[PDB]
């Protein structure tokens, strides 16, 4: 019997800063035990200072990103070239996902950008539509490896002040754009070491009030 779904592997990572947002993802596309591509873009700039990546089944991922980019295009036509806010984009993607509730997109989509206050925003989506604004989110194959690390290093979980006998937690002094990239790169190298579907190359898309910047880094090709 024909199975309409597949697993293209990969892992994406989205961390929201104080006035910035990053959306990273490996460039490796796979099928079973074979590498389809060592460089296949996964994080896309959709316009209006919004970046998007739908990881899982690549055919469903490409269709959703393509349909959202078109939704942004029509939002300009219908509403006199109004900028689509990150919360408005998030709600729009829910209806795009829930529209196929009984035949879902097999993807974990994450969007990053800035809110109407200029603060960093990251939204993570369920394959069927459920969404929530989060501080940081890893999605895909090595998501279970990266997320516990982020709780410890970004949110300072299980960390206390030395000498306080575990009564005072480590203060939430938030990280700069340089510090977040360091955590992103270390997350993906650790993912490449321990997960077979992660590697080849890392591409990070940084979103600020100026626009969208792109950075590329080499990963292990084994």
């Amino acid at each position: 019997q024909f199975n309409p779904y597949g697993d293209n592997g990969g892992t994406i990572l989205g961390i929201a800063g104080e006035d910035f947002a990053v959306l990273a993802g490996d460039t490796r596309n796979i099928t079973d035990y074979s590498i389809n591509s060592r460089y296949e873009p996964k994080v896309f700039d959709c316009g209006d200072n919004i970046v998007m990546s739908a990881n899982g089944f690549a055919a469903d991922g490409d269709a959703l990103v393509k349909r959202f980019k078109n939704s942004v295009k029509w939002y300009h036509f219908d509403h006199n070239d109004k900028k689509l806010s990150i919360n408005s984009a998030a709600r729009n993607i829910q209806h795009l996902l829930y529209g196929k509730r009984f035949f879902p997109y097999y993807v974990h989509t994450i969007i990053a950008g800035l809110d109407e206050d200029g603060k960093g925003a990251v939204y993570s989506f369920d394959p069927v539509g459920s969404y929530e604004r989060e501080q940081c989110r890893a999605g895909g194959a090595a998501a279970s490896l990266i997320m516990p690390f982020l709780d410890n290093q970004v949110n300072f979980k299980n960390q206390y002040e030395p000498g306080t006998n575990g009564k005072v937690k480590k203060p939430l002094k938030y990280l700069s754009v340089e510090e977040v990239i360091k955590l992103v790169r270390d997350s993906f190298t650790s993912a490449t070491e321990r997960h077979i579907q992660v590697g080849d190359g890392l591409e990070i898309l940084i979103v600020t009030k100026d626009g969208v910047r792109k950075e590329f880094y080499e990963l292990k090709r084994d």
């Binding site: 279970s144 490896l145 516990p148 690390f149 709780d151 410890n152 979980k157 299980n158 270390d186 321990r194």
Partner: protein, 204 residues
């Protein structure tokens, strides 16, 4: 359905400078239901430490089996069991039940009394020896532990510094696992002394 996912729990081992560390959570459960917060998964026979994950009935059985076998070993050899030799004893004992295996994830940790060499080892349910110089992980949050250990670990850590590494690797992995938590305990193994520390963590 999966016998290694009924009770829950995790064990992690790490090497350092002239020292080894082994840690586990204290949770015992029945699917969603939490049963016990005192189910220790680390056991010792002389100076060799063993951490067992998986089905709790097999955890207790193997502990009693390896206590049975190390006691007879000590009477015959007139000496305590060694980490390298005990690793082979676990491997052969697990493979003896190849087609009816104990649903476990055993972890050996200790320092050789003669050479002073830090030693850790890992096993699957059928007795495959995983001898890594860095870290050994096992349990329902094995993926979470692999991600923690690969990022936090650095070679040649002091006993006081290695404690911080293994504790943070265990706690943050257990908080991302439903079947792990409910307290934690860390052993710091040295040539002369062993320090046992209970950790403060989330109770949900």
């Amino acid at each position: 359905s999966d016998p290694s996912s009924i009770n829950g729990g995790i064990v992690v081992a790490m090497t350092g400078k002239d020292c080894v560390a082994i840690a586990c959570d204290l949770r015992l459960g029945s699917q969603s239901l939490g049963v016990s917060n005192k189910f220790e998964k680390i056991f010792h026979y002389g100076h060799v430490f063993l951490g067992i994950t998986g089905l709790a009935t097999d955890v207790t059985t193997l502990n009693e089996m390896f206590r049975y076998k190390t006691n007879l070993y000590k009477l015959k050899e007139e000496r305590a069991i060694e980490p390298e030799t005990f690793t082979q004893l676990v491997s052969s004992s697990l493979y003896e039940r190849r087609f009816g295996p104990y649903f476990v994830g055993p972890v050996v940790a200790g320092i050789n009394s003669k050479s002073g060499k830090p030693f850790i080892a890992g096993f699957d349910l059928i007795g495959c020896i995983d001898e890594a110089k860095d870290f050994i992980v096992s349990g329902t949050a094995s993926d979470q532990l692999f991600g923690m250990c690969e990022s936090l670990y650095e070679p040649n850590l002091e006993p006081e510094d290695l404690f911080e590494t293994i504790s943070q690797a265990l706690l943050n992995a257990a908080d991302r696992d439903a079947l792990s938590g409910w307290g934690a305990v860390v052993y710091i193994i040295k040539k002369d002394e062993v320090v046992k520390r209970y950790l403060k963590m989330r109770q949900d």
